[PDB]
Amino acid sequence: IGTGYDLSASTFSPDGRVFQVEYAMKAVENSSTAIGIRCKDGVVFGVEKLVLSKLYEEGSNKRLFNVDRHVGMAVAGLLADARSLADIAREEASNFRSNFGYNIPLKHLADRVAMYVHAYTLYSAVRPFGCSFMLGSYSVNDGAQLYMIDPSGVSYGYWGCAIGKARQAAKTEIEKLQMKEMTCRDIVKEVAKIIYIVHDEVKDKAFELELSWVGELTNGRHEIVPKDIREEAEKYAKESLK
């Protein structure tokens, strides 16, 4: 379906499909799954960061960025475009704080970055970003927020979302949760469980779980999950995986 109308994001297919954006989405669904779940007191991210060669250091090619003092960012797809969008989000938050004098609401940061990525879905001189990403923040006066932005540029709030190869399975297993009533200390455990379930040990041999939450436990600061809590979460996930 294409071969004549899929050469530029500035071209509509006879049935009104911008095929370049769909190919960017195809790119992002061929990447390791990153999940995020929103609970009462924050949002916990999780990444099945594959290790392509063991020559890399633990922590190479992080997919859990930190775009502002209170906003995290999980990414899937092309990592170069993910880092570029992370810098765009960082610049947007910085400009917001400089002009309006307070922290950017995530409902606005998501909109700004989504419009930035939408600007690349219109012109033949540029190409759509090949990365869908999640943003998560918690502030006492606005609560926990979780948003997804895809290559098209659509932003929606999620009580839990998955991006990558195993989006469907991860969402199916997330729905079994009751995240609206749970806390971060348990949501991290369940995020590890979900990542280990959706991972396949036969096609992609090895991966390291990269976790990070932002919430009341961390005073709104988005931090990588402490090493001991990550060890406990992986221990639970492995025991559950039996």
Residues that bind other proteins (CB under 8 A): 4-5, 7-18, 66-69, 90, 94, 97-98, 107, 111, 114-115, 118, 121-125, 146-147, 152-161, 171, 174-175, 224
CB-CB contact of 77 with 130 (8 Å): yes
Tell me the β-bridge partners of 77. 131
Counting every residue, how long is the chain?
242
Closer by beta carbon to other proteins, 113 or else 188: 113
Q: What is the closest distance, in whole angstroms, from the C-beta atom of residue 143 to other proteins in the complex? A: 11
Tokens of 44: 């916990």
Closer by beta carbon to other proteins, 219 or else 238: 219
CB-CB contact of 190 with 37 (8 Å): yes
Q: What is the closest distance, in whole angstroms, from the C-beta atom of residue 239 to other proteins in the complex? A: 26
Q: What is the DSSP string of 64-99?
A: EEEEETTEEEEEEE-HHHHHHHHHHHHHHHHHHHHH
Closer by beta carbon to other proteins, 154 or else 206: 154
**How far, in Å, CA of 187 to CA of 206, rounded?**
23
Q: What is the closest distance, in whole angstroms, from the C-beta atom of residue 53 to other proteins in the complex? A: 22
Q: What is the closest distance, in whole angstroms, from the C-beta atom of residue 32 to other proteins in the complex? A: 20
Q: What is the closest distance, in whole angstroms, from the C-beta atom of residue 160 to other proteins in the complex? A: 5
Closer by beta carbon to other proteins, 56 or else 206: 56
Q: Vertex 80, ends 155 and 154: CA angle to 5°?
A: 10
Closer by beta carbon to other proteins, 127 or else 204: 127
Q: Which residue in this structure is represented by tokens 């939408």?
A: 118
